[PDB]
């Protein structure tokens, strides 16, 4: 029932009656009031919070607006059928605090539930969105968690998440290749144009290999994202 | 009316008022409360359960989150039109128990209603989803029950379900071939591109043969999934 004054940036999808505040899945609070500070244009939101979270409500409690992920409905303007955005929250130790500034993005993954974080370095994002899938032999075994730019502008770092029971699949010699969008070919004496994975065509996908000999990779081990399965082939380089 | 504390992992689609708990089709309970244990991040859910199931509510009672199956609506972000996830349950003998840990997946099929479980070993899943269909002469006679990886990483095992009245179709000499996605050809003096089965193009399909001479297969008999009808042709191998 306690109200906390958080100055968000822009109150685009925030409803004063139904916008929830979820802590890692569980709806903990509900947005009560929105006013504005004309000073620096700070959209001050007051949210009711259950007493269980009031104990850990401390200075390093991070709030960030979680919008629904982009898809066909979002890009087609069918905003009535997409879903309501909410406020994600991750508390810290800090000091007992009643005013918070919004984070512009979701912070880093910190859950220790046995799932695997790994990092893929790519020249660009490609056709991967947040929540696009990871396949082992077209079996989804994880999803894209987040993407960002490395401080050097010459890369893109994508950190992806692997389910706990599939963590043994990722070896040190594993190779990851992009499978996103469709390419057609017109060959001689026949043009074998075929489509298999429709969800990849919509949202993008990564597919990865597991050699039988390497040690199991772990703990944010970096990898290189090959642009194609063909570019991921394990051959031998010969200089000419 | 009894409440049972089950520590789920993540409370993504779980609603404190309308998420049901179904036992093999029949809604038996309804989710009442969700709290969290900050210790190990265990999302503790309390569910009302009718008294009939309270007798068999025992230590080997398995609960697992059943999400709606992936489709065009799910991949396009039209989550309002997909359907609400629920909690599947299969009880065991065990001992009378009031606290349960979630299963990460649906357990093995155990119903003895005369339907047939068989296993297909494939190099990869292909374009098959859960619930993709099985055809005898483009008549649906069963669906894909589950897929998994064999302990050797060099395969994928798909166990599929055959309806009771069609159990006589599967002989020991039966052959299963993938029919999923569309392939086009550009031939000489005409390019005969044709499409027939749209549901296969959306979700994937398996089609199988029935020789008239073999004994009727039964009881988790393994089979080999050919990638195509052409690869499933019953010829004679000649070494050259």
What DSSP element (H or E) covers A72?
helix A72-75
SS (H, E, C) B126-182: CCCCCCCEEEECCEEEEEEEEEECCCCCCCEEEEEEECHHHCCCCECCCCEEEECCE
Tokens read off for B94: 């065990």
Q: Which of A156, A103, A155, A108 is nearest to A128 (CA)?
A: A156
CA distance B165 to chain A (A): 31
Select from B37, B45, B73, B76 the residue whose CB has the most chain A CBs within 10 Å, as the one to mutate to test that interface: B76
Strand pairing of B222-226 and B176-179?
A: parallel
CA distance A35 to chain B (A): 29
Header resolution in angstroms: 3.2
CB B120 within 8 A of CB B222: yes
For residue B74, give Cα distances in angstroms to A51, A69, B81, B116: 35, 12, 9, 29
Are the Cβ atoms of A139 and B125 closer than 8 angstroms?
yes
**Bridge partners, residue B27, by sequence:** B22
Strand blocks (E) in chain B: 2-8, 20-23, 26-37, 42-49, 62-66, 86-90, 99-101, 116-122, 133-136, 139-148, 156-162, 176-179, 182-184, 205-208, 222-226
With b for 16 or more beta-carbon neighbours within 10 A and e for fewer, the A134-151 pattern comes to bbbbbbbbbbbbbbeeee
Find the closest chain B residue to A69 by CA distance: B77
Q: Considering only alpha carbons, which residue of chain B is nearest residue A137?
A: B124
Cβ of residue A212 closer than 8 Å to a chain B Cβ: yes
Q: CB–CB of B133/B199 below 8 Å?
A: yes
Inform me whether the C-beta atom of residue B199 falls under 8 Å from chain A C-beta atoms: no
From A181's Cα to the closest Cα of chain B, the distance in A is 14
d(CA B204, CA A170): 27
Residues B28 and B11: their CA atoms lie apart, in Å, by 20
CA distances from B218 to A50, B56, B59, B157, B168 (A): 56, 31, 32, 17, 9
Cα torsion at A122, A123, A128, A129 (round to 10°)? 100
Helices (H), A112-152: none
Cβ–Cβ contact B43 with A under 8 A: yes
- Nearest to A33, CA basis, from A65, A4, A62, A61: A4
Please say whether the beta carbons of A107 and A65 come within 8 A.
no
Phi, psi of B78 (to 5 degrees): -85, 60
* A120 phi-psi bin (left φ>0, alpha ψ -120 to 50, beta other): beta
Element containing residue A199 per DSSP (H, E): helix A198-203
Q: CB-based contact (8 Å) between A74 and chain B?
A: yes
Reduce the DSSP state of residue B120 to 3 states and report it.
strand
């Amino acid at each position: 029932g306690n109200t906390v004054t958080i100055d968000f940036m822009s109150a685009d999808g925030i409803v004063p009656g139904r916008t929830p505040v979820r802590y890692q899945g569980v709806e903990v609070g509900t947005v009560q009031d929105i006013s504005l500070s004309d000073d620096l244009r700070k959209i001050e939101v007051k949210v009711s919070i259950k007493s269980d979270m009031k104990d850990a409500l401390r200075e390093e409690t991070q709030f960030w607006l979680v919008t629904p992920k982009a898809s066909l409905a979002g890009v087609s303007g069918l905003d009535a059928l997409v879903g309501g955005n909410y406020i994600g929250m991750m508390p810290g130790k800090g000091k007992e605090q009643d005013h918070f500034v919004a984070l512009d993005t979701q912070p880093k993954y910190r859950l220790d539930n046995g799932d695997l974080m790994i990092h893929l370095q790519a020249p660009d994002l490609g056709s991967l969105n947040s929540g696009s899938l990871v396949y082992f032999r077209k079996i989804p075994v994880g999803k894209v968690y987040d993407y960002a730019i490395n401080p050097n502008k010459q890369g893109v770092v994508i950190d992806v998440l692997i389910e706990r029971r599939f963590t043994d699949l990722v070896k040190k010699g594993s190779r990851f290749w992009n499978v996103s969008g469709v390419d057609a070919n017109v060959s001689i004496s026949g043009a074998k144009v075929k489509l298999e994975s429709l969800a990849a065509l919509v949202n993008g996908a990564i597919a990865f290999d597991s050699p039988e000999e390497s040690k199991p990779a772990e703990a944010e081990d970096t990898f290189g994202l090959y642009e194609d399965l063909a570019h991921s082939q394990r051959g031998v380089i010969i200089k000419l």
